[PDB]
Curated annotation (Swiss-Prot):
It is found in: Nucleus; Cytoplasm. Widely expressed. High expression is found in heart, skeletal muscle, ovary and testis. Overexpression is frequently observed in hepatocellular carcinoma samples. It comes from Homo sapiens. Acts as an epigenetic regulator of myogenesis in cooperation with DPF3a (isoform 2 of DPF3/BAF45C). Associates with the BAF complex via its interaction with DPF3a and HDGFL2-DPF3a activate myogenic genes by increasing chromatin accessibility through recruitment of SMARCA4/BRG1/BAF190A (ATPase subunit of the BAF complex) to myogenic gene promoters. Promotes the repair of DNA double-strand breaks (DSBs) through the homologous recombination pathway by facilitating the recruitment of the DNA endonuclease RBBP8 to the DSBs. Changing W21A: Loss of interaction with histone H3K36me2. Residues 7-64 form the PWWP domain. This is Hepatoma-derived growth factor-related protein 2.
Amino acid sequence: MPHAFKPGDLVFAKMKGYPHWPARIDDIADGAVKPPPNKYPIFFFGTHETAFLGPKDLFPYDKSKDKYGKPNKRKGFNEGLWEIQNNPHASYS
């Protein structure tokens, strides 16, 4: 049975105007800016950007990859597909 989201979980993350995007739940470094309540820090593969999102926009990667893990014209997307499949826990800083 599902737990709550935790750092290191792999997802497709949805934002307005963009396709469901390969991403992970990040940790928050000591001394770093925390997310608002009920939000998670989402690191987007390929673009390497961070946004804060709630569970309604987070789709577990294993269950969703058949639907969302296809190439896309958008900047950074196909790089992101490689990262989430091949080294999803690496440092991308």
